[PDB]
Write a protein that binds this ligand. Structure first.
Ligand SMILES: CCCCCCCC/C=C\CCCCCCCC(=O)O[C@@H](COC(=O)CCCCCCCCCCCCCCC)COP(=O)([O-])OCC[N+](C)(C)C
Ligand SMILES: CCCCCCCC/C=C\CCCCCCCC(=O)O[C@@H](COC(=O)CCCCCCCCCCCCCCC)COP(=O)([O-])OCC[N+](C)(C)C
Ligand SMILES: CCCCCCCC/C=C\CCCCCCCC(=O)O[C@@H](COC(=O)CCCCCCCCCCCCCCC)COP(=O)([O-])OCC[N+](C)(C)C
Ligand SMILES: CCCCCCCC/C=C\CCCCCCCC(=O)O[C@@H](COC(=O)CCCCCCCCCCCCCCC)COP(=O)([O-])OCC[N+](C)(C)C
Ligand SMILES: CCCCCCCC/C=C\CCCCCCCC(=O)O[C@@H](COC(=O)CCCCCCCCCCCCCCC)COP(=O)([O-])OCC[N+](C)(C)C
Ligand code: NA
Lengths: 656, 656, 115
């Protein structure tokens, strides 16, 4: 979006527009940047000769105070590794030779910035970045600590952009930057503690998830370097370590939205002998096209919180969702729930809520409308032993079940779901106000304010408008509720803005040309008030009003000019762009409507699972226990899938 | 669609979560799976030493009872050929060495499952599947019967998916799996009986049809392996053997819908000397572009039942039909019938049925409408010697010819044709009810119930609506009847569902705001009843009613709010999506309308052929007799086709 | 280059960097530090900004017969120097015109309609 702002840059080439201490520092920092090799041995010989004319037991502290910048913590060796020259291999040798003779060596190698913006960045981070593996091998031989954590403002941005975040450790920098050979050069060195956490709490595997691309692209160098480090560890320690916000690297993969690393993590099978337990897919038999598989689902099903099925559905800012739902343990565990408990509970809602409106409509439409007997037609009003009184009791007790439950569902809703049609925020607002106006019509009848009938008529209106919610069961009618809502909130709300300006504008312009015919008693014009003349232009938009242009008004030609100017501007011009602008939109819905429906069916599957007791939820608890190795008890989900179109491709290529 | 369910898997690697007999069996079945070669010779030496401490003449039965699983019939050698190792070549030698010393050998080789799900699967089937031709040559040298039929639940699925079906024989498994070299290795072995039938009755050639793809694709390994086996046989025995359901492999090719094998089978020409009779296309002379050909049509024309011209037209679930009709003996034998008997009989129906409605309309419209003389205007009612009485007799006798014949055509109609526009199921339902209401109007006039005129008016309505059927003769008007029926049953029936909810909803909502003006005697509102207020909203949809909003009703502002809320919801919003959703549909018809018309003309060609006597059908019997070889009498169809655009391509490449 | 409309030579002339020793001054783009993806740059803008007449930002906007304009506005010293002006003085002055001219018509309409 917008570029960031950093105060001091990391290394500057351009000069911007005591002295003996100023004489000697800058001549070292400049000469190390172009790499004059003779100039290094001149200054450093005089520098140790300078420090002899200084108090002992404070001579190493004065020595580094020459070598260091004052405002930033950068030393001499850091600028050398930044500014690459052919003369680097000589001056690195001398800067290691000068550190040997004194006690400065351990202080010199592990130097970091003390600057607030770039803190912690050691010399070993700089050698890895510039594609210099051989200076990196010497700094390891010099004894640089490989657990160096560079916590800083620049190394921890608050957004995705405005910074660079890799994991604050030299092993994560090696793997994110497409550098294979440095990784085994660091991992086979036994002093490297792999399992260690940064300021965010991430280990090595969380970082590689955050540097991927969700699209399937040409090269996937964050995917293969994820794999090389995992097998070399050979344990479940890197997989199940959980960060500060309580996510594992599979649960983080669904959170960020990376839809290609996540396809790998489900479908791992390693079939060699010592590396057997790392697999999450187990194939037990195959025969031609047919193959059976046992998926793991230890953290996929909803038996625990923050499951990777719950994260995909209920969370937006995940841009691509439907490409994640079509994965194999995710597609089956929605479809297997649909045939067992979920298709009947959606049917029982449509039976009661359609029998709720028939009981509401007949009560209001056949009510006593005479003043001599005006009961409330609901809630019995009296004691008459009237027929069908299992109905009027049924309206009121179901009106509280809708009011309270959606009133809970209003509150427990994040601000992310308010701004998208993909989320069902809009239906909890329309079912709720239908429950309010019913119980208010009993509440306003009782206190005798006597506006009760207006709220009950609006209750019968929205009571049949919300029957369009239950069309999301079919596929042929499920697209027709989505395609309406992609037309209203996109385009039609841009139409009713501009059309008001032409309605408001000519509304006063025609009202000012008449003198009041209510003084004339004839009511000759229908354009008397502003509220009348606006209405007579609305009938001229649909085609309902009549051009009674024989008019006893001041300047009747100008009154006839503006009516023709109105019809050209808004009947042929604006209303036939709205057909031409909806035509772009409806074709853009029809290609991708089948994806949006399967999401909005997969939201009411997981809601009806949460409305279950614990025994009945565990009655439909899918999966069995398995023993796939020595000392192992895992969960399984047998899928006997068959692949005709893929098997013919594999067997055809093998001969030729 | 949905995956299948099988009880016991074929071979399991994963353990699920007397003892001396339990001690020795599992140590054989495990050691044969990883292939420790020393462990085999330890157990089998002790096993024959174990059987000596057992009753003689029951020693081989006890021996196999160790080697076999109890619940399934799988033996030791089957798990070896499944679990491929580098140590298979040793343990196959020893398992053949151990079978030699006893009388177990013939029992050991031909072992099958006795399991219900996987019955009949021998060891020779398993060696072919794992791409192991060399173990297959040894098992033939061991003496495995090649006629092994594996009838089973898994080897015979009821659908296309949920199983694997290849033909239940090791020759069909060799050919379906893209394995050329094993085929001649089985066919040149003289013990292989090629002509043999499975549970479905199929021979070798029926199976290869059922494993193809109807699309023309990159590789066609089921097409070439069909050809290699046919010439090596060199006889008409494999072609004309007919299965249990009475189809030949050409008639089965049209039934399943495979449209690429079928193109090959028509156009075969083999021009070598001993292989001459197998061809179905005969070229006698050619000269540049022009070439003449004699097609075979022994089982193509409709002179016998289940002809391959009758199967394509009258049967659906064949997805692609029009790509099959454009083949060369199928395209000519429809077009040659169109110029001889079929274009006149379609003309004679349009002449009579248009002269049937003029006689019907003039009789009803110029009837005696006075009460002083009210005859039935048809069927003479009297004896007056009235003029033009060759007309009223003509209506009634033709009304029975329509009623009975379509009433036969109602019954003899499969449930497959009821669910598609491609089938003419809908026209037999509308011509039939037009014949009923005419003969009922004479039947209801006679018994003096006196509702006769209502049925006769509906008879005049559908009598001109069915004249849209006879537009299928032209091409310019033939698309316009198809494009109507792809708009009604797709989209408009989804419109009249949602529009009812907005009509039903505001119908009660506006009816509840008025007190009954029939008590006021003025009839001031047109919104009195529910049946009135729904009608006044229907006129506001087209543009016919008038917004008489000056209304003496309770809360007149809310009555004015809902009318504007109705017009926005359904005149600008819903009715202009229906134009925008028909626009997707009509362009999707216009590209493929020319294909759907040629099918619906090719249905009334074969119907008018069935309405012929035997002499007049044999009068137009196409084709002559031929003698294309020694002792041969076949049918022929000479086509002198010319190919300019193909001949220029062939002759241009030949120089360069 | 902006006058005639040539939109490919102009992309080169902005983004020249020569890093050899005697040929240093000819560059109009200066890179001072980079680290992985992040890179900083100093553009020249001696004749790009509107501090003088016939600037190459004024020629692109106010002159037609330049067929392709929007491919020229997306260049890097031209895209930033429009967006940086939008957050400092330009978005408020467009807001003050919409406030006065909408309060100009309400004062006009009420005066004529209630006359
Ligand atoms: C009464 C409970 C709440 C009242 C209520 O509002 O009901 C609600 C649920 O309606 C239901 O169908 C579930 C209610 C029963 C809960 C217990 C399940 C019993 C298990 C049975 C297992 C048998 C199956 C096995 C068959 C072999 C209906 O309200 P709604 O329509 O959901 O609200 C609109 C939708 N919205 C939430 C998005 C806005
Ligand atoms: C498909 C939809 C599009 C079709 C629209 C086609 C365009 C319009 C089509 C037809 C317009 C109607 C023509 C009839 C004229 C009325 C009669 C009349 O009064 O005569 C008057 C002259 O005529 C006028 O000057 C009338 C004033 C406006 C008429 C149109 C002018 C331009 C409209 C806006 C231009 C575009 C604005 C927007 C730009 C995009 C003189 O009257 P009189 O001398 O006093 O005596 C006559 C007696 N009488 C009054 C009883 C008769
Ligand atoms: C009377 C017989 C049945 C009555 C009848 O319904 O007629 C039917 C056939 O109408 C015909 O044209 C065929 C009737 C004659 C049958 C004998 C053929 C004579 C050979 C002559 C050779 C001379 C040619 C050679 C010239 C050189 C007309 O009914 P329909 O319109 O088909 O019904 C609607 C269509 N639908 C069936 C799909 C619903
Ligand atoms: C191209 C098609 C689209 C264009 C449509 C554009 C939108 C509509 C365009 C124009 C609407 C017509 C305006 C005229 C008002 C009537 C006069 C009146 O009664 O004044 C009343 C105020 O006004 C009202 O409140 C009337 C009630 C509803 C009017 C519209 C409200 C929102 C409609 C639904 C919103 C969207 C719902 C669906 C969401 C998608 C007050 O009356 P009074 O104080 O008692 O005294 C006046 C005396 N008299 C009554 C005799 C006059
Ligand atoms: C009075 C001056 C002219 C009158 C006038 O017409 O105004 C005009 C400018 O309206 C303005 O907003 C600018 C007027 C102030 C000029 C001095 C700027 C003060 C700096 C403030 C810095 C504070 C921001 C910093 C905040 C931290 C409005 O007229 P218009 O709408 O432009 O005319 C239609 C458009 N058209 C020109 C294309 C046709
Ligand atoms: Na119209």
């Amino acid at each position: 979006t917008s570029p960031p702002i950093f105060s001091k840059p990391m290394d500057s080439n351009i000069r911007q527009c005591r002295q003996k201490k100023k004489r000697l520092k800058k001549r070292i920092f400049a000469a190390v940047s172009e790499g004059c090799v003779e100039e290094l041995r001149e200054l450093l010989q005089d520098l140790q000769d300078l420090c002899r004319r200084r108090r002992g037991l404070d001579v190493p502290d004065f020595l580094m105070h020459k070598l260091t910048a004052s405002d930033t913590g950068k030393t001499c060796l850091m600028k050398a590794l930044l500014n690459i020259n052919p003369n680097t291999k000589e001056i690195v040798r001398i800067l290691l030779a000068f550190a040997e003779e004194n006690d400065i060596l351990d202080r010199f190698i592990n130097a970091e910035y003390t600057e607030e913006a770039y803190e912690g960045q050691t010399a070993l981070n700089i050698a890895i970045e510039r594609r210099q593996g051989d200076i990196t091998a010497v700094l390891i031989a010099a004894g640089a600590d490989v657990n160096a954590h560079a916590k800083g403002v620049f190394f921890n941005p608050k957004y995705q952009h405005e910074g660079f975040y890799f994991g604050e450790t030299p092993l994560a920098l090696a793997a994110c930057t497409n550098q294979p050979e440095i990784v085994q050069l660091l991992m086979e060195n036994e002093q490297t503690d792999i399992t260690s956490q940064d300021s965010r709490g991430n280990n090595i595997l969380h970082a590689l998830v955050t540097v991927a691309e969700d699209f399937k692209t040409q090269n996937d160098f964050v995917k293969r370097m994820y794999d090389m480090i995992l097998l070399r560890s050979g344990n479940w320690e890197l997989e199940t370590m959980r960060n500060n916000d309580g996510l594992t690297p599979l649960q983080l993969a669904a959170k960020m939205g990376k839809a290609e690393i996540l396809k790998y993590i489900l479908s791992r099978e390693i079939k060699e002998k010592p590396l057997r337990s790392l697999s999450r897919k187990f194939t037990d038999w195959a025969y031609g096209p047919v193959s059976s598989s046992l998926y793991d689902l230890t953290n996929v099903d909803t038996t625990t919180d923050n499951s990777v099925l719950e994260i995909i559905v209920y969370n937006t800012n995940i841009d691509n969702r439907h490409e994640m739902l079509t994965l194999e343990p995710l597609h089956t565990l929605l479809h297997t729930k649909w045939k067992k408990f979920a298709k009947y509970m959606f049917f029982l809602s449509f039976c009661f809520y359609f029998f709720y409106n028939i009981t509401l409509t007949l009560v209001s439409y056949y009510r006593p409308r005479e003043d001599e007997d005006l009961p409330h037609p609901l809630a019995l009003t009296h004691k008459m032993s009237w027929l069908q009184l299992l109905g009027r009791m049924f309206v009121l007790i179901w009106a509280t079940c809708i009011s309270v439950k959606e009133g809970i569902a209003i509150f427990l809703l994040r601000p992310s779901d308010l701004q998208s049609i993909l989320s069902d925020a809009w239906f909890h607002f329309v079912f709720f106000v239908q429950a309010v106006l019913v119980i208010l019509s009993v509440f306003l009848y009782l206190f005798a304010y006597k506006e009760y009938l207006a709220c009950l008529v609006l209750a019968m209106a929205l009571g049949w408008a919300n029957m369009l919610y239950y069309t999301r069961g079919f596929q042929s009618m499920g697209m027709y509720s989505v395609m309406i809502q992609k037309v209203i909130l996109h385009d039609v709300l841009k139409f009713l803005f501009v059309y008001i300006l032409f309605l408001l504008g000519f509304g006063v312009a025609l009202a000012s040309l008449i003198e009041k015919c209510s003084k004339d008693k004839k009511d000759c014009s229908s354009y008397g008030s502003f509220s009348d003349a606006v209405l007579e232009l609305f009938k001229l938009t649909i085609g309902l009003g009549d051009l009674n242009i024989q008019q006893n008004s001041t300047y009747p030609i100008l009154f006839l000019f503006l009516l023709i100017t109105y019809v050209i501007l808004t009947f042929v011009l604006l209303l036939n762009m709205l057909i031409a602008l909806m035509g772009e939109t409806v074709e853009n819905v029809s290609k991708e409507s089948e994806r949006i429906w399967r999401l909005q069916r997969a939201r009411t599957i997981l809601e009806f699972e949460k409305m279950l007791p614990e025994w009945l939820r565990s009655r439909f608890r899918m999966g069995e226990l398995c023993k796939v190795a020595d000392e192992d008890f895992r969960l399984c989900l047998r899928i006997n899938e068959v692949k005709w179109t893929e098997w013919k491709t594999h067997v055809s290529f093998l001969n030729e």
